[model samples]
Target: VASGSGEPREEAGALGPAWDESQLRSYSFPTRPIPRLSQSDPRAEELIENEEPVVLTDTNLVYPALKWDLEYLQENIGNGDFSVYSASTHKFLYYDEKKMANFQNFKPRSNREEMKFHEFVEKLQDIQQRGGEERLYLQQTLNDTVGRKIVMDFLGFNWNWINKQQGKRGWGQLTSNLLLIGMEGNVTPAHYDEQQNFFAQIKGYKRCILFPPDQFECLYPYPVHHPCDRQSQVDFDNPDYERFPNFQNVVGYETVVGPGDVLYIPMYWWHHIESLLNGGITITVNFWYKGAPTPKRIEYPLKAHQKVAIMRNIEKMLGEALGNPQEVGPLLNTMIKGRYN
Candidate 1:
């Protein structure tokens, strides 16, 4: 967490649901601050070329959104329906249970509710102050649910600043932006998203731990089509090395983000996020955009992430070829045991 002195405070404790506070004390890895670049600066290309996460910190880059907080949102944002997830456990997975039923094979493990924006904020604050078993997290998109005034504030964001970066990198149109509000100690477990992300922290503080795409083998991601697809199977806090031996080899880049900081998380990078325990409620907004399209010609000596992409394609092809998801694994074993070994 960042203190008033502008330095981060590192503590030895668990932030997620899968492990105890002391579980990771014995583990250590190299870490450096995610670089802070100004929006008008010329060094963005270097950050992209290195494929490393960076914090964009020009005060002029993020306005109005940087000014947003619980009270400001309640007053100016107006009455609107918002989605709130209530859980006895702190971990809130990406999908919702009621909504995932339409999909052929996706199951959500958390509970949810719909309430007015102000009401949700009240409940979140109430829970934080009095302490309760049910934790609340508000996750909603900046759509009609928000009033015209809030929408105007949304429009005030520096779109041209971001769009220029998108065009430079060959990424597609800006798809969506989500408004997230979470109480202290909230955790979004280790997972990787398929699209590129520009996560901006607006209130309180958050700690983000990121690993590169090449660490796929070490991280043990779920099956491509599983409900938990893209999420790592390894329990971060109390990792079962017997089951995931390669996790011991994993190294990560860590950073703490405060208000006015924007984190650039490249597509497919594994990240675990947490709101500082006992810190006040946190507010964040994320800009998600599509990744660059695959090139027409394949390049020699495929990039690390490209290799992971190839592995995903092979799994999907085998599932289709065998006609049963069950048979894909056995067929892969048959192909690998003798010749590859």
Candidate 2:
């Protein structure tokens, strides 16, 4: 167990079969901002109707709530703040006072769990030197107060809307949300996610580059069986031309986001995010959602949550049964064929 849990373990070289070379491909988008629905405002109605990703410039956003702060996190979550579970490499980070230190190593550490407004500011003061004086420039939400807030808000938004539309079901809200933060030079390795999300920025600026879900061919994620499944095989800073010749042709969408901007990122969208090197303490929050159901009942085989659960089960079973890379092809085939079968 590690302190500040919720972060994926860092691995060098290639990823496992689940994160292999063939699973990722590329697609194109006519525009950078996908169409999205406006919870309010009529002029933006077109976006909501179409489910597009739009850069929402105007929205009433206050400072994070009392529950969404750091000091409160210290008061709540336990040590070992950031540790991934061995069951499936599924990492979890939440604000709990009881679990505070890293189980992996006894490093001099602070409580990185969820915090209240007042506590985050205090912790900022203590760690200000390592991350600069920007008290709000916290990165990655796993095991941190801000991260959970982002995930919660994102889920709340869609959950309310979808429930209203579908007359409300018994399903619990989404259980998955993830984050990664870095200085100017830091970048999230390219990858595709099957979950729905609303990625928003709070402070400073971060440039988001995206590819469509259908562009699985362009991105070149690791093979499905490997540990790094769904991760892009190419390095943006310096791509390997010899191994990935087609990568040269992959076009990307670059969008810069600041505080109060929400980017509707649909399921299966491939993205790589970066903070400006010259930009001080970039802070952003993301909301991953359990997608809504269709207007009518889906096929008998699997609905959204069921499908996601199936994927997780397959990953775990295959990772144990056949190792990581072996999971991708067989699972993907199962999904594509199962929908019809």
Candidate 3:
């Protein structure tokens, strides 16, 4: 079934999408289920049209990738140095490396170091056999760097359907696809992506928790300049209500995805994704698309995501004018504390 080049076909029937609650990594937050629907379902299409979230089934968006097991990946994926993130704990809290250039005071939460493909797989096996120590996540972009066969598999994706989805919604051009391999129970903490993402599951299952852009206060995202700019400060395993008071009022959507499933992660929506604890290594490929440009005739009552964007701009502008990201907050407090009250 795993070959160099061929037409995309429906796979994932052998393993099926059978999974249990016990397989899911436990979380301490309150959430509701994100609905799953058929790819051709009007409700599902409506969600995409409206820029909402849903898991689409039978889409075959990345059918070619369904055969991308760890072994297949190791053999086909180039043996070149890979970008791997290491963490002492299960959480791989993402941060912007570019932002770290001037952020001398704050230290990065996770270590993003490069390791070869073989070493990465070996360490992954070690972690799987021994169970629990350091967690590693391999996030490699899909390009020629991965070699011919892998690129061929990448090209064999159901681009006709995906391109139709992009055109139907008027979303911007295709940006990039990231091949992600995460250890069991590993987490990419609560964060919002600026670009729209079609998160295609390839191997095993992952539980995703999503919050609307309106939950900005609840999530407590760091400002534009910080390394963890879009990531939530609250810990899903052990949330501190004292520091994150609004989190108590926050409600979110959740879903568990398996091979042949694609989750639409709308831009500006905060999402937390975790590989199932006992589900072995989880593989996912995300198709990110740039957001559609603002229409010429802008309307009032800005979208929640747009408001978040404006707030980011405000933070950036104020920080630039004040010459310190730290000072912008104090200035805001000074200006708003009494006036808003």
Candidate 4:
């Protein structure tokens, strides 16, 4: 996601896409439930096994009246004259090209810096009539008593249940959200993140398609040099088989999550999210936590960590040698097929 209003825009250097899946085709691979880090974690793997994304009944991550507040935000804090953030701005291609230097990048109208949730609600509703997507970022401090309590409970849940079970440690200063993403066909391109994301759906249903990182070759992510780095190159509805023959081997897990469902997106998994067609306004609050710090060195052949390192080295070396990471294909072929015989 691109930086919202009030946040100083950092110019992204030449980022690259991760992979090329056009050599593959079809979404046919083994699908199974992810195992729990520990058997006693509060969340259940059975739900995932059943292919049912769970709804978190507790409203811990967001401030209370979160739904009402979102409805208000959609109505106001908008750009009246053909602005980008308005849900009506059908930014199909620009959906997730955050690090690029080209057009679809958003521009904020007001110089009013950042927004505070409680205060921004009124400001947003006031702009509803003007219309256009107007996404505002706000500090997640609890503005009301219920909010403060919910925030506390959220922390407690993570600290007591999640952390203890997984042995994952994190600080409390998590970056939360007040998202108002819409547009009939605005699709968050297939991408993955490296943080603990507690996605609390506040309004409407969003179809989320996820694939484990192990399916790296299957998904064919863009090169790391592209603006959409770590994003899959394969399209969801209509993948071009001629370009991505291996795409057929990619398996996906789908879930249409509606209001009240909380999907725990683990760190470093691929996900493509879409707001349903004709779906009412979509609202969500995501609790983003800093990743658990790297531990002492360990070794595992063909492990995820090793694969990531190999990719990084390849990207850096080839980008420098070929002047374009896209040219690394010859090198990959030479390395992979050379000594096999």
Candidate 5:
């Protein structure tokens, strides 16, 4: 649903919010349950080697849980400025600010509005009753702009544990913490990020479907320099088999997370996420950071995600040399045809 439209819903049912039949059926992968471990579980470190997702239970690492819901957030930072992205239809495609400047006539694919936290919360609540096509997703960083009270709560996150993990992996700095608020049925279609993520679900259930880095070829990502670089081209609802036949073969790992659950999203793994339909408004906070720098040491054969990173480096180097993104493909073909293939 990321870049596509959602079907019309006439009303909210006894069950709660509803999504179109096709939308619900689009997720067609057999699921393997992600192992849930406790806070101090040594097994958590071992699970990462499999290059799959795992859930961390007993997430009271971040105390003051009751103060994180919408009511508390509103009471503390209601009037603070925040960014709210609205869609006339219920999909949102991630975009790059740098690339957007190149298209002078570019009409934004979706509507993005700036509002106070209170206003965004009001609209989110209203949609719960109306079950309208309009959908809003609030994505912003927790910083001084949000409010002092909110910042104070943010400081309570368990940095000791986070730092220990980073040190273990020799990863880089903690880049950002994003606060994401969404209404029931809001979908963030399949996309992958360069950095590792610690996704904490605070309020409601979120259904996540993930594909490992090895499945990159089957996913059909956009061109490196394209605006939607890290996103898949195939639409899950109406996949074009003619264009991406291998997508049919992709197996996804799935999980449903609720309050106090922390899901570790390994770098470069593709994920499709949704706020469970009829599950009411959902709240989440995510920690992002660049994973370990290019390994100084290597074995005989690189791992799947390492290979993906190598491809990225090659593409970036070509972009720099050719001085044009369009030329990289043609040049690559010329270079690979007789020599490598």
Candidate 6:
């Protein structure tokens, strides 16, 4: 059971099936395995078109990034000051700072602090032996300032394949490529983004738990104007079933994606991803795209995602109409109470 410190880990060339179930954090809910297929498989694109989550293996989507370790990145990833998040635990749940100002008394467990990229790397090395209340994760978008070497590699991304897929899938223009570098055991709590995602795993393994857009009731997202908008309220590892009984029925898809695997995170799907514990560092570059145009012609049997969008609009509108966040809840309760029941 004792592998020496010199033992190679699960990286690109290290005989890396790198981690196992024990490295995974336990959660209250059960999830089925997400299917994996070869990148060139016919069913791969078919599943993507059908809006199902799948992990595409042996892809060159971000092969240039596979060599991007902390040292390699610290040199080429620009001179920019990156925002590193610090949390009370290993979890790095997102919260908007500007929107948070609207709620005077509210504070998320995580804080978004700014520091030089090298400074972040330096302190990350410190966490090697130090295990305290603090944890750090660097999530920044790729900028031109990321030096010439990284720019060359970035340009070498499999754009032709991705661009053709986007066109074929009726996806809109390519959005930003968010560069994520996190420590082992770090978590980005359950959340959904409006855009479609092509998640390219460059290093280490990330266990991603995904729930389809239809699980609206199960995930319980925050209000549109709330700082934690688009994030689930349920504490998965320590679920409070009394406060969130819908979680009992919450089901999802799970996968431990490794290097050279490209994960298709369908639009608006609730995903809880973590850098596996004891798996060392993990790196990923995400491609986000605008979704297809809004449905028109008053289609019958509205899609679940459509309902989520509709609910979002209603919440935003209500926030605008009512001056106080407190009033929105009471008004909704009054509107529902016994009448809807």
Q: Give one digit per residue, the lDDT tens place, for model 5 in 1-341.
A: 22122232233366543334333335544556667788678788777545467888776645544357788888886466787888775557777767664344546666677888888878877876786678889998777666577667677777788788778767789898888888777888799998888888888778778889999988999777777778898887778889999987887776667777789899899988888776777888888988877756777688888888788889889988987767888998999898999
Native-vs-model 5 lDDT? Answer: 0.76
For all predicted structures, in order, the TM-scores are 0.85, 0.53, 0.92, 0.60, 0.85, 0.93
Q: Which tens-of-lDDT digit does each residue in 119-227 have in candidate 6?
A: 9988877766585547788888877778888988998889888999899988998889888888888999999999999999999889899999999998888878788
Task: List candidate 5 stretches off by more than 4 Å.
Answer: 1-26, 49-51, 101-108, 125-131, 333-341
lDDT of 1 by residue, 1-341 (tens): 21111244343385334222321222234444566777666675578655668777763445787778788889877677888887776677665333343355554667678889879878877876786767788888877767777888787887778888788888998898888899777888788887899998888778788889989978898766566667888876678889999988887777777777789998888888887776778899898989899899998888777888888899889877877665767888899897897
Candidate 3 lDDT over 292-339, as tens digits, reads: 888899888898999999999999999889877778888889988879
RMSD for all candidates, in order, please: 5.7, 13.3, 5.9, 12.4, 5.9, 4.2
Q: Per-residue lDDT for 214-257 in model 2, tens only?
A: 45555666544444556677766567878877776675554566
What's model 4's overall lDDT? Answer: 0.51
Per-candidate clashes, comma-separated: 0, 85, 0, 41, 0, 0
Q: By TM-score, rank the candidates, best first.
A: 6, 3, 5, 1, 4, 2
**lDDT, candidate 4, 1-341, per-residue tens:** 11101121122373432112221122334433322222233455444322333444443434343444454543443421212233233323333334344323444232223434434555555655667465332323332323443444334433443334233444334654434445334566677776656666666666566776677877777666565567677765677878888877876665555555567676666777666655555666565665556547765555563475478677768867886555677777787795863
Clash pairs (backbone) in predicted model 5: none
Top model number, TM-score = 6
Cα distance off (Å), candidate 3, residue 18: 2.0
lDDT of each: 0.75, 0.47, 0.84, 0.51, 0.76, 0.84
Which portions of model 4 show Cα errors greater than 4 Å? 1-55, 63-65, 69-71, 74-178, 320-341
Worst 10 residues of 4 by lDDT: 1-10
Q: Provide the lowest-lDDT 10-residue window in model 3.
A: 1-10
